[PDB]
Design a protein around this ligand. Structure first.
Ligand SMILES: OC[C@H]1O[C@@H](S[C@@H]2O[C@H](CO)[C@H](O)[C@H](O)[C@H]2O)[C@H](O)[C@@H](O)[C@H]1O
Ligand SMILES: [Cl-]
Ligand SMILES: [Cl-]
Ligand SMILES: [Cl-]
Ligand SMILES: [Cl-]
Ligand SMILES: [Cl-]
Length: 138
């Protein structure tokens, strides 16, 4: 088991055909999960499931540049459940991050930060027990 918040270095940044796999379990009565792909202080891709935003479950995606959040992209398809184990896979493609949860496609997020080789750390936080965080090339 890993301690949350967890920082996974991505040596030399991300590259198309890099696959990041995160395994864990959502805690009971969870409020949030966040994956933050960082370029220094900037957040290239924030993936943020929210379990209770105005009594709705929603996934918020965004980018933070110079300490300012941009336009949110929201997804109402919500594959997570409190108490249950999950697998998140993030596949880096030339023009998008592609996210699958529990082997089902969820969403894609167009690259706003374009210096892919400078996105060199992934922060994982929120109301989860973290089992594994790794990457490979496909
Ligand atoms: O966009 C991701 C960040 O969202 C904010 S919450 C955010 O607040 C603005 C007002 O500034 C609007 O109400 C949005 O509807 C709302 O989603 C979080 O505080 C950050 O941690 C990011 O998750
Ligand atoms: Cl949140
Ligand atoms: Cl970084
Ligand atoms: Cl839930
Ligand atoms: Cl693409
Ligand atoms: Cl950039």
């Amino acid at each position: 088991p890993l301690i949350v918040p967890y920082n996974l270095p991505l040596p030399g940044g991300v590259v198309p055909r890099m696959l990041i796999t995160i395994l864990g379990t959502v805690k009971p009565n969870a409020n949030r999960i966040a994956l933050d792909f960082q370029r220094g202080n900037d957040v290239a891709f924030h993936f943020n499931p929210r379990f209770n935003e105005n009594n709705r479950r929603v996934i918020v995606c965004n980018t933070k540049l110079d300490n300012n959040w941009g336009r949110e992209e929201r997804q109402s398809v919500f594959p997570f459940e409190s108490g249950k184990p999950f697998k998140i896979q993030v596949l880096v493609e030339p023009d998008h991050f592609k996210v699958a949860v529990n082997d089902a496609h969820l969403l894609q997020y167009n690259h706003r930060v374009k210096k892919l080789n400078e996105i060199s750390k992934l922060g994982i936080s929120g109301d989860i027990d973290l089992t594994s965080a790794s990457y490979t090339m496909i």
